[PDB]
Amino acid sequence: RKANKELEEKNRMLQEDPVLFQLYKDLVVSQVISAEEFWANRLNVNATDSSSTSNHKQDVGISAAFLADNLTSDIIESIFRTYPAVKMKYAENVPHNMTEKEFWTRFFQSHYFHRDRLNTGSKDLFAECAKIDEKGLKTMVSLGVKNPLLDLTALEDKPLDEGYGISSVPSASNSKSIKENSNAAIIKRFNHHSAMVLAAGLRQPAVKRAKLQESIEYEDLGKNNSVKTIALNLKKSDRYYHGPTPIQSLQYATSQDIINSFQSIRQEMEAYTPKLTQVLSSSAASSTITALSPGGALMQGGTQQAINQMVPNDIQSELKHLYVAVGELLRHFWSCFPVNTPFLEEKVVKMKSNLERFQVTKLCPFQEKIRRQYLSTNLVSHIEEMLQTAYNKLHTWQSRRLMKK
Amino acid sequence: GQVRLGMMRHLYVVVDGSRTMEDQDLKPNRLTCTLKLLEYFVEEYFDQNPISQIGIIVTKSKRAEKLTELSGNPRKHITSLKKAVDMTCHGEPSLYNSLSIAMQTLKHMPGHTSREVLIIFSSLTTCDPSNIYDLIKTLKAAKIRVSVIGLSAEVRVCTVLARETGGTYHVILDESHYKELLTHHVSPPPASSSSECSLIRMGFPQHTIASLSDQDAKPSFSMAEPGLTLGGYFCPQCRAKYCELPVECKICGLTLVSAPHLARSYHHLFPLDAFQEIPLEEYNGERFCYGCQGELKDQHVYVCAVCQNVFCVDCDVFVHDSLHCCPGCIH
Amino acid sequence: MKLNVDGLLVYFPYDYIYPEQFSYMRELKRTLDAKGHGVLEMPSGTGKTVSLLALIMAYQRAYPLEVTKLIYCSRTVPEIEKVIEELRKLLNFYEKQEGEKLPFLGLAL
Amino acid sequence: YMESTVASWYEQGILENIQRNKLLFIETQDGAETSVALEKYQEACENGRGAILLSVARGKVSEGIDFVHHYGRAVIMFGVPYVYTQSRILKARLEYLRDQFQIRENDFLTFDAMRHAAQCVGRAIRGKTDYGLMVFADKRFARGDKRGKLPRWIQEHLTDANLNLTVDEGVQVAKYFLRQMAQPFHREDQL
Amino acid sequence: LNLLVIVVDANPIWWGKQALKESQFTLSKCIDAVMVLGNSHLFMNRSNKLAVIASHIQESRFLYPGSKDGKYELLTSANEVIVEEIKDLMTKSDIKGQHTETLLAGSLAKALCYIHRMNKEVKDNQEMKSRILVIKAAEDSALQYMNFMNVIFAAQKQNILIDACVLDSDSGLLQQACDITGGLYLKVPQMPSLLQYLLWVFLPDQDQRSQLILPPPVHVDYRAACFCHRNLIEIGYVCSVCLSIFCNFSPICTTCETAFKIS
Numbered sequence A: 001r002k003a004n005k006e007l008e009e010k011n012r013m014l015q016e017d018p019v020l021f022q023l024y025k026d027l028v029v030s031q032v033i034s035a036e037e038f039w040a041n042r043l044n045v046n047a048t049d050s051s052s053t054s055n056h057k058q059d060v061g062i063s064a065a066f067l068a069d070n071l072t073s074d075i076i077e078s079i080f081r082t083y084p085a086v087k088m089k090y091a092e093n094v095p096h097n098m099t100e101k102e103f104w105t106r107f108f109q110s111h112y113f114h115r116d117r118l119n120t121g122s123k124d125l126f127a128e129c130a131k132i133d134e135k136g137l138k139t140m141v142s143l144g145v146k147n148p149l150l151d152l153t154a155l156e157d158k159p160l161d162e163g164y165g166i167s168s169v170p171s172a173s174n175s176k177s178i179k180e181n182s183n184a185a186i187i188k189r190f191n192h193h194s195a196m197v198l199a200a201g202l203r204q205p206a207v208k209r210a211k212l213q214e215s216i217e218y219e220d221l222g223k224n225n226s227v228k229t230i231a232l233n234l235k236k237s238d239r240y241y242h243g244p245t246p247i248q249s250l251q252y253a254t255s256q257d258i259i260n261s262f263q264s265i266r267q268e269m270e271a272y273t274p275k276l277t278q279v280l281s282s283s284a285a286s287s288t289i290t291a292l293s294p295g296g297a298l299m300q301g302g303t304q305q306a307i308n309q310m311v312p313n314d315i316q317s318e319l320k321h322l323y324v325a326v327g328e329l330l331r332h333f334w335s336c337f338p339v340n341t342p343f344l345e346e347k348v349v350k351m352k353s354n355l356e357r358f359q360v361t362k363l364c365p366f367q368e369k370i371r372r373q374y375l376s377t378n379l380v381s382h383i384e385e386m387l388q389t390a391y392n393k394l395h396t397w398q399s400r401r402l403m404k405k
Numbered sequence B: 001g002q003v004r005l006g007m008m009r010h011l012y013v014v015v016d017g018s019r020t021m022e023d024q025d026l027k028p029n030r031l032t033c034t035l036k037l038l039e040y041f042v043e044e045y046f047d048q049n050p051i052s053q054i055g056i057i058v059t060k061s062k063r064a065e066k067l068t069e070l071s072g073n074p075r076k077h078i079t080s081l082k083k084a085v086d087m088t089c090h091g092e093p094s095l096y097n098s099l100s101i102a103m104q105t106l107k108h109m110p111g112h113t114s115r116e117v118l119i120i121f122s123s124l125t126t127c128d129p130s131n132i133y134d135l136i137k138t139l140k141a142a143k144i145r146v147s148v149i150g151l152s153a154e155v156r157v158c159t160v161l162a163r164e165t166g167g168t169y170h171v172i173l174d175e176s177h178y179k180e181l182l183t184h185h186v187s188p189p190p191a192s193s194s195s196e197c198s199l200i201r202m203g204f205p206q207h208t209i210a211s212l213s214d215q216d217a218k219p220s221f222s223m224a225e226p227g228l229t230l231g232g233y234f235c236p237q238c239r240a241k242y243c244e245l246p247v248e249c250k251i252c253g254l255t256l257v258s259a260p261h262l263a264r265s266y267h268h269l270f271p272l273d274a275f276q277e278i279p280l281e282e283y284n285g286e287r288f289c290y291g292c293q294g295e296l297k298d299q300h301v302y303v304c305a306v307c308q309n310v311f312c313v314d315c316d317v318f319v320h321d322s323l324h325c326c327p328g329c330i331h
Numbered sequence C: 001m002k003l004n005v006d007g008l009l010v011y012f013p014y015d016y017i018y019p020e021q022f023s024y025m026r027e028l029k030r031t032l033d034a035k036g037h038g039v040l041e042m043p044s045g046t047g048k049t050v051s052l053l054a055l056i057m058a059y060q061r062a063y064p065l066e067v068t069k070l071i072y073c074s075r076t077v078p079e080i081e082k083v084i085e086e087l088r089k090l091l092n093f094y095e096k097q098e099g100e101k102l103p104f105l106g107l108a109l
Numbered sequence D: 001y002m003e004s005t006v007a008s009w010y011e012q013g014i015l016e017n018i019q020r021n022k023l024l025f026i027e028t029q030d031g032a033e034t035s036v037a038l039e040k041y042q043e044a045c046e047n048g049r050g051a052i053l054l055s056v057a058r059g060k061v062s063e064g065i066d067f068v069h070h071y072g073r074a075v076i077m078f079g080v081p082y083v084y085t086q087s088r089i090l091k092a093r094l095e096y097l098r099d100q101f102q103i104r105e106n107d108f109l110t111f112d113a114m115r116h117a118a119q120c121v122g123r124a125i126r127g128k129t130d131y132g133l134m135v136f137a138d139k140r141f142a143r144g145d146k147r148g149k150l151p152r153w154i155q156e157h158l159t160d161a162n163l164n165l166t167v168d169e170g171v172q173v174a175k176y177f178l179r180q181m182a183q184p185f186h187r188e189d190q191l
Numbered sequence E: 001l002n003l004l005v006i007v008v009d010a011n012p013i014w015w016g017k018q019a020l021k022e023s024q025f026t027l028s029k030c031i032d033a034v035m036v037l038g039n040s041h042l043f044m045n046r047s048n049k050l051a052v053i054a055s056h057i058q059e060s061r062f063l064y065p066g067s068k069d070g071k072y073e074l075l076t077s078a079n080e081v082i083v084e085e086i087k088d089l090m091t092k093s094d095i096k097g098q099h100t101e102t103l104l105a106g107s108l109a110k111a112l113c114y115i116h117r118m119n120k121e122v123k124d125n126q127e128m129k130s131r132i133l134v135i136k137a138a139e140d141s142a143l144q145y146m147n148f149m150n151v152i153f154a155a156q157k158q159n160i161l162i163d164a165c166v167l168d169s170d171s172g173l174l175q176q177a178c179d180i181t182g183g184l185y186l187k188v189p190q191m192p193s194l195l196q197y198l199l200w201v202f203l204p205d206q207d208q209r210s211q212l213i214l215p216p217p218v219h220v221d222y223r224a225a226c227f228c229h230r231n232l233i234e235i236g237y238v239c240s241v242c243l244s245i246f247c248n249f250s251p252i253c254t255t256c257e258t259a260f261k262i263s
Ligand SMILES: [Zn+2]
Pocket: B235, B236, B237, B238, B239, B240, B249, B250, B251, B252, B253
């Protein structure tokens, strides 16, 4: 059982697959495989179902604001990633002047889920933060990342040297009323939300110049299509012409013999239409029918399939469980064998492999005392042969380690 | 076949889970049409090379789901494609999630074996949890080739991903055009200089029967819904019964390939001689086409590079498609 | 590619030949032959500065005395920078075609 | 008009559908916000997500910046550019032009609007080997008074079948054109 | 509508030795058996079509391309054209030291393309089943193996079954061709009685063959010998660059002449 946690992980793997559970039970009785080792094999996979996550790249807060209905809906998780400040405020309020249940009461409170104030829905507060932070990024903050260019005022020469020229209304602050002013605020929220969606995903002349560098030149001009695909040249085409299967017939004769055979075949072909071959054909047919018919001699028919047992399908299922358990053990022994590195640690790993192989052979002997004695079948001999092959490789490794010593 | 080709190819197929596949831009719904063409492509890919294997992953709602495990059997992939038609296929697929899992699976596979990923997108818009550009840099570091096929759309991001990994971007202008792209995918691409090339040990398992009428036969069961396996191929390294001859032994890690399968891939090593086509008879040596021993019914002459034997259009098309040899040269 | 105006050979860095470009060059040459301002409509897809500079430079090489100086005016400062960069690329191709050293003076204000 | 149209679109179930198809990057009166919207529009195209930017043809900012072909595959013109708040200065100039020369006041107004509109329309094409779509949503273009003011090279590309297209028919023709240009062009084909 | 194509490997030297032996079976008897089988195939279904091809040592000739005795006119005409073709090819032969054995692969390649042109001629709405019958008396050639393998793959791609009967000795190339195609492989002990064997198994249509009981095709072993020293190995290293079997690992691969990369 090792660690109570390792044992629970092994139990979960056994629960997932019925065939695996039977193999695990046989190994536990044998003691060939540790519960921790079984848990490690179960946890020997790639990543998770969603691996990293499933965050959106557009309209993350505008996916289903107060329309889908903490860590409940994936929508609200994407919204938390989209606005870090809103997520931080929610986390701080969780035990301070508010609870999670209280936050849910606020979520469905009137003027929010009911959309009776600030229109929108559950992204109303998010949009308020967006507009405010966009105005702050246009006043207090600016373009933090600004190199040779990558800016706005610096990108367009120097801001707007419009030192009282003729055009200025454009940004007419003194004139913003309510309807048009509200629409301008909505544009600010959308622009900030797009930046926030980019922020959720990852936890200008300079851009144009980089694109120009990518466009300049070609991959073919650099090298070719797939980098530098090396040419393939074969010194001997003759070796391929020769067949791996052994030559069935290989015989020759003298040139004079070839002339004699040609003369006889020329005479034989000219003779034709014997007609009276019926007597020979009738005698030949009588011999052929007996061989061609399934009854009688000269017929190729085997497939005895005489499995005298109680329930053969159940016996086959028991063998499959034994094969799965033995195969997993053989895979572990082969991994240890691959890393030879003849040393003291390698000898310890080889001793562990031997112990597990011997315990698997004891399990095969117990299986022989089961359905190979009661039902007189379960041919565990093949499973024993696979274990013997692993033992033979272990014996070869021991010989190599002795030669190294 | 002058360029180096990968004898073992772990091609990976990614199918879009977007609602756009459900929308019928073509006369049939795109998801069903693409899956049917993929089924033909999977069968052709396995037929062209038995050693090469395919793995299918479908991303739905930005979550990666493995439609089929990488395997040498085409039928299992075809069954998974039928299941994909059954699936809702609703919500934007995640390019990042599928690529990350596929790349991790490829990392386990040996560097010398060619590792490739094929992606089909029905929507120009791409939605993923993590930035696509960061993943493309990771793919460049890994020994993986990525080819992206857009459906009736051209995407700069997909082209950039393909060029960086050495893959070729493709556009599905027509269903027939998509079949041609799949035929190009079935053919092995030239091996990159970065890709490792090394001799690989091969185990050849001769089939073992039940000796003489079950003479002390080693009756088995399922050693990678079976019965009593008395007559089966044995892995040479571990002497274990195996149901299918072209299956890599899981415990040994040693690929098992039959001699006829190697003979099939011999044609790939040497390119077929091109046949020059002239509408004019041009004093043709033989009125009868050499291949079918019959006079041409149309004014087309095919001339081989060396033998220069006459070939009719039907013979020329068949020779490239299946024969993979010049009949006049064989004589 | 070299283009003959019958007074000089015009060298194109792109080396791309178009029927519209050939028709434009003939019409522009007629405008160049007869002094008197004039308005010419050129398609947006072709670069205005690259096409105009190549013919003007060839005419200036053929007839240096006629034009003491060349002045280019652009509405925006980035366009002024683009004209100078395109002129520099055109000069480099001209330098490869002619003598190894081909000094030219270009100013952006 | 653009702000008013957006407000009407938000009330109807149209703007939300447009947002799903493409990220919205409406231009703003503030210069810094307009530059941020343009940069965000470029970033979405690099990402491959659909990006839509709403801009004013009359505004000088649109004239100053030409959209890159990758950033803006298709350019759409709605209506004919006009100034609602235009002062008496333009009207006085039109009368002065009539007295000094021989220019029709209506013809000058149509020509002035068209030269700005044509410049905005012709930003999709930056190179000979490029694919671009130009769409006009105004009936006057169909009448042809606007078409005559438009440059001759654009008129040669324009077709009677293209003129007065139905909204569904125009979108279908554009989709067919994109499928035809999806396959890569070749240098020999240009020659 | 079933197409049966019969390809016979004819070696003048081997057939001449049979004539010198003076055994009752003769090359003439073998062709007579093929013609009787062909008449029966046409007789059972008018739609069914018969094509007969004979392989010479250096070339392949297609034999197939009234009721005087009351025999069906079409059967009589088909037999007459075959009789003229077979006699002309057999009477005159050219002795070559390089190629004393007839090329079955060349004849098979011609047959497969001929079936392909005929299939194109056949209307798409009507369905045609294509099967090949091969009779081989010539010895197998190691050089012909590369050409032979490609023709088997062409038959597999075109889904044409190949059925082969061997008069004297089973051929490894021929048995492998039947195994890949899935066509039945049979060995005939008595050469004079070959016609009776053809009628029982080869003559019936694929639907008829399932209904009747026919002897199972012989299992084909798979043998891998390295071409380096022509020696069979249970395990052979295969070079990635040239796909060539090696009895033992080689630092430098002779077949492609490239040097294996060593870490
Ligand atoms: Zn093994």
